[PDB]
Design an enzyme around this catalytic site. Sequence first.
Site, mmCIF file in Angstrom:
data_model
loop_
_atom_site.group_PDB
_atom_site.id
_atom_site.type_symbol
_atom_site.label_atom_id
_atom_site.label_comp_id
_atom_site.label_asym_id
_atom_site.label_seq_id
_atom_site.Cartn_x
_atom_site.Cartn_y
_atom_site.Cartn_z
ATOM 1 N N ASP A 97 0.791 -1.232 0.000
ATOM 2 C CA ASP A 97 0.000 0.000 0.000
ATOM 3 C C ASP A 97 0.825 1.285 0.000
ATOM 4 O O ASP A 97 0.689 2.126 0.880
ATOM 5 C CB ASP A 97 -0.963 -0.017 1.198
ATOM 6 C CG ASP A 97 -1.875 1.212 1.256
ATOM 7 O OD1 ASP A 97 -2.375 1.680 0.213
ATOM 8 O OD2 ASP A 97 -2.085 1.725 2.372
ATOM 9 N N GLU A 121 1.355 -0.767 13.789
ATOM 10 C CA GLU A 121 0.342 -0.027 13.020
ATOM 11 C C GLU A 121 -1.031 -0.042 13.685
ATOM 12 O O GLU A 121 -1.495 -1.089 14.143
ATOM 13 C CB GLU A 121 0.177 -0.584 11.599
ATOM 14 C CG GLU A 121 1.343 -0.384 10.655
ATOM 15 C CD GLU A 121 1.023 -0.861 9.250
ATOM 16 O OE1 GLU A 121 -0.180 -1.025 8.935
ATOM 17 O OE2 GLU A 121 1.971 -1.102 8.471
ATOM 18 N N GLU A 128 3.667 -7.772 7.441
ATOM 19 C CA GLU A 128 2.409 -8.441 7.120
ATOM 20 C C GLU A 128 2.478 -9.586 6.099
ATOM 21 O O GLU A 128 1.713 -9.603 5.133
ATOM 22 C CB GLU A 128 1.407 -7.392 6.640
ATOM 23 C CG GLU A 128 1.133 -6.334 7.706
ATOM 24 C CD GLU A 128 0.088 -5.326 7.288
ATOM 25 O OE1 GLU A 128 -0.129 -5.152 6.069
ATOM 26 O OE2 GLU A 128 -0.529 -4.715 8.189
ATOM 27 N N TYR A 171 -6.350 -3.019 13.229
ATOM 28 C CA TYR A 171 -7.241 -1.973 12.744
ATOM 29 C C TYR A 171 -8.677 -2.244 13.178
ATOM 30 O O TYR A 171 -9.626 -2.049 12.408
ATOM 31 C CB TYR A 171 -7.138 -1.859 11.223
ATOM 32 C CG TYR A 171 -5.824 -1.268 10.764
ATOM 33 C CD1 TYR A 171 -4.694 -2.063 10.607
ATOM 34 C CD2 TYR A 171 -5.716 0.087 10.486
ATOM 35 C CE1 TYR A 171 -3.492 -1.520 10.197
ATOM 36 C CE2 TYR A 171 -4.523 0.638 10.068
ATOM 37 C CZ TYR A 171 -3.415 -0.170 9.924
ATOM 38 O OH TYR A 171 -2.224 0.379 9.507
#
Lengths: 620, 620
Positions: A181, A527, A432, A492
């Site tokens: 990303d 994150e 990740e 998240y």
Amino acid sequence: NGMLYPQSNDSRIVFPLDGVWDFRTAGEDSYPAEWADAPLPEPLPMAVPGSYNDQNDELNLRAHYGWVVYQRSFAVPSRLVAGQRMILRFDAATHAADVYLNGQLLGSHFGGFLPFEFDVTSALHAGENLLTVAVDNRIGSSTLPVGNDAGTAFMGSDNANVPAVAEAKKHARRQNLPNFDFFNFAGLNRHVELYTTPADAYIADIAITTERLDHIAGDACTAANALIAYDVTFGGDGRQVRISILDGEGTVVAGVTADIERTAKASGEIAIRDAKLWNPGAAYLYTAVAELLPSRIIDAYRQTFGIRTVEVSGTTFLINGKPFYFKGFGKHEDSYFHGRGTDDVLNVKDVSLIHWLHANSFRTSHYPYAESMYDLCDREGIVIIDEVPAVGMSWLQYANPLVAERHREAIRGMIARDKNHPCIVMWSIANEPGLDGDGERPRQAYDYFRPLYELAHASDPQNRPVTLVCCQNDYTTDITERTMDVVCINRYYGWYNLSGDLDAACHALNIELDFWENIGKPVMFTEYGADTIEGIHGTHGEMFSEEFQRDYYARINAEIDKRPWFIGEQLWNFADFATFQGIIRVEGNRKGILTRDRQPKMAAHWLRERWAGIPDYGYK
Amino acid sequence: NGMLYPQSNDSRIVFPLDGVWDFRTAGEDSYPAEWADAPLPEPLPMAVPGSYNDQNDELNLRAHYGWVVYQRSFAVPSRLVAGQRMILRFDAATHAADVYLNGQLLGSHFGGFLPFEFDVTSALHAGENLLTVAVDNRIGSSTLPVGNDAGTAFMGSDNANVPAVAEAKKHARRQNLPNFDFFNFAGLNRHVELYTTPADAYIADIAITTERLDHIAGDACTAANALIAYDVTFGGDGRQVRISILDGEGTVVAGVTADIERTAKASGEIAIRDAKLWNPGAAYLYTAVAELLPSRIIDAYRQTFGIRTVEVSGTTFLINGKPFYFKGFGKHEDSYFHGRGTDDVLNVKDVSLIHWLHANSFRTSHYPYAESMYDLCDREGIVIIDEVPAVGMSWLQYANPLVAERHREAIRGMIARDKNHPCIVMWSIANEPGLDGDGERPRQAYDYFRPLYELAHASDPQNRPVTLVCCQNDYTTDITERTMDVVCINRYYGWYNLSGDLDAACHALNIELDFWENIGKPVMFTEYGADTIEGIHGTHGEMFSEEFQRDYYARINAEIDKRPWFIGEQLWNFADFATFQGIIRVEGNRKGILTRDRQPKMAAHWLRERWAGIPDYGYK
Ligand SMILES: CCCCCC[C@@H]1NC[C@@H](O)[C@H](O)[C@H]1C(=O)O
Ligand SMILES: CCCCCC[C@@H]1NC[C@@H](O)[C@H](O)[C@H]1C(=O)O
């Protein structure tokens, strides 16, 4: 192996080749080889160091796929080259490069974020020299970072069930398809330079380590005695090297003469009385001066270092024996015109913003940064997690030997470059990757990463902790992350799941925290966050509003404050940054607590007030 | 007199001193001189080149008044310095500087936008050299650019009739009070480098001029014969210099050997058959190579030039005998982190945006730009109006001898630096000085500026036209502007007056145009526009909307298209830029047709479409 940054002194000179070069786009899988033999035809201007993608608005270079060709001329006095070893260094060429000098292919390199160099002593001639560099931006299933050989980009929208879509897809213009990303900025992203060393014998590498500290002060400003070790590697060909230790004032506080023994190498230890330690928020740097002896000096190199220990003990992260708490974020090398191009003005500013925020750390997401940033953090007392470009990985890559080798190439290379920086306290070997699932997939992931974990430990003379940044997954079937030295998690809750529901998000978070409580490893965020458009406001903040971003960190941080084994909060992201276009990317990734222009959103002020009240040591 | 940009070749080497320096703030009117004797205490990092103001968010460096001190160390091999003339060059230090090397005062310089240098041959020594640079940002009644000694900033608001305001003002923190509308970015804004030449004898200056063109082709791509002149200056000490003219392919197409006579100088003419001309949108560059002869070469310099003529004839502006029409804008060297710092990535991008817009020119408002931008425009075929920092001037300055001399220094300096660039077609000696009024004021202005007009003509071997950019004033009492070679006017009908009424603005405009029609000089816009916040929209666009900005240029340009003697449209501004804060400045000046991040507003698209249909030659 050593890749010391080029230095100017009485034995060495550096000639920078940065500036405005000539430039042409080329083909999807080729470029004209004859372009190396003569000046580029109808060239464009292209500044370097820098990404090429945003330097020409007449073209759509963001959409470019394949090769480009850089070229320039340069000339140096014959009296400089006489009897010297001449080296051409590329700090970074993204992602792969073929290098030509005066029509001679010097060689090639893959890896867009680590430096490489060529001995050009025999390739140089008097007068104008012609330097041609072909750069390949292509990513795919065997590259790091990982691209998709077909399908969509990450977080991609598709309606494959439509026949018309499936057909149009087969004829679409070829594009890089990232499994990551951030935008695929390419080109001569960092500096290019020619440098000299002595030819007969020269300093090729230096490693400084902090071995032991005796009687550390209560405030850890000093140690009564510090034992440091040196390892100097030589190239070339009763020889000796002089090693002088300089304090912050330049006063020589120690000096020893060491024997060179044959890969010529000199190594030993040095005791430093009342040594001044390097700490977060309180940096101190020494200089190790290595001088190759024949009163004359044959060769010399000045290597900055800092005296500090790093040790994981139980659920604590100890720097100079003190329990550290990470306050910070993942960053990117990203800015408007430059793209991924290095910019030291921005680096200087960003470090000041880190102080302004009262953060103490960041991670080099998702690739090694420019060498100058580590120097900057060394002197400014900011802690770094150093990460290789191993992003977008899954089981398809683990079965590929070429990937495994490129991955080993990234780790030894990163650590070879960055080993002497006191600011680096931990290595990250991936961001990740796929780690979970059923059947043999968890074990397959484990078997891929464990020897890379071992490699990182074997490669680092300081033996810093090693981690792997874990995506939001099924933590119950993932068997790899829990074996790392520090558990680093990307979560998240409340954004990508349980969207907008902060009560449910905190409830879900606490359930996973209960899981990690039992594993008994130190755990930190690397994150978490929420996309945020500056200027969007609400009395009851909804997703994308500044208020929601503030609420998000407020609710989440209140939960981790309740866990003594939770040793750090690095959010996503420091600042908004460019991505491939898509329906969830509003002019890129907007999870920055700062705008792309480094202006503070509401959450930044709130975090600043929070971090001001949390000490680097002893918070937990 | 000469200030050739440092070059590397077989007789010369350049050592760049850019990077991350040490930095401290100092006092309002002093700094500790002893800082030159030793490393700065507790220094901050500061990237060079760049403005210092936006490189530290912990401090408020935008509010800083007075001195700052830069410092770094450097070392070069003794064998390279051996027998060479060593020169330390500062491309720009804004606004004034004291330079020290190893504790020795080298000297000082006033002028923030032009380069200066020191012979440091004797001040250098082996090993580490300590370079300390004090920089003064202060502006006032004697500086160029002009600051206010008391009162307000440019268009600054006050309620002086309030006793409380009057008193608080007297005790307020001291600040620079600009009489100009751009922020006072300061520091080492451009490159710093050490370079070498031969000591006994060396080329000190080179001037190339296009004297005459014979039988120009219809498309002006070629002339049957071009007569160019060279003028080479030497320093140091029947000697000779060889001059080779290289075409775009490097082929020597003409060459002469000229005798050097002592002020060592060689001058003469060269005839070039079928010479390729430099035009807007179609650049062609030759190289004049000068080689100082003893087959061996003593010294050499390669000077890029372009062959073209510029002539004002009646109401026409002739480049290579064809009637040129200016399409463009005033610019700024301005960007988010760098401030006024030079950024070659941004320069390359901006040049591409100019092409994207189908503009053909700009003005260096309001100061000479970095040398690299002119090189860039030389090869990209963009025409330049080159302007000195004489902005904010009024009658108070015309009576000041220090100002007059600083003004003469800038004019001679700009032209000495920039004379060889084909892209430069005109000089500007001031922006918006006071020229009008009653009594002796118009005559006083004339008597101040007329010898500067004469000086610009005398200084420029190409004898390009000279102008002065006029503010919106009482044009009937102004007696100076109409005597310039081209009338350059800044007009804001419909913005600062007749606000929002475009019918009335056009009516007023046509009335002033009727006035200029009779003067019989060529006339162009150098400023016109409207502050515009991107994202503000209306069906009937009002001030600050994207639509109003578009409507504004559409209505105004329709009126000037009716005037055959009206030879150019340069708008204000290329891009939004930073200013001193105030009630009419929304995060700076928003009159850019692009945002500060170089994104196109609605007006940019409209202008792009209009300019696409307007040819460089023969529009009028
Ligand atoms: C929960 C599902 C996975 C979340 C993925 C979160 C992503 N991690 C890696 C970063 O490079 C991305 O920018 C980040 C994001 O999209 O902002
Ligand atoms: C109408 C009289 C005032 C016009 C003043 C217009 C100004 N001229 C010079 C530029 O430096 C300013 O930015 C411009 C402005 O304010 O945007």
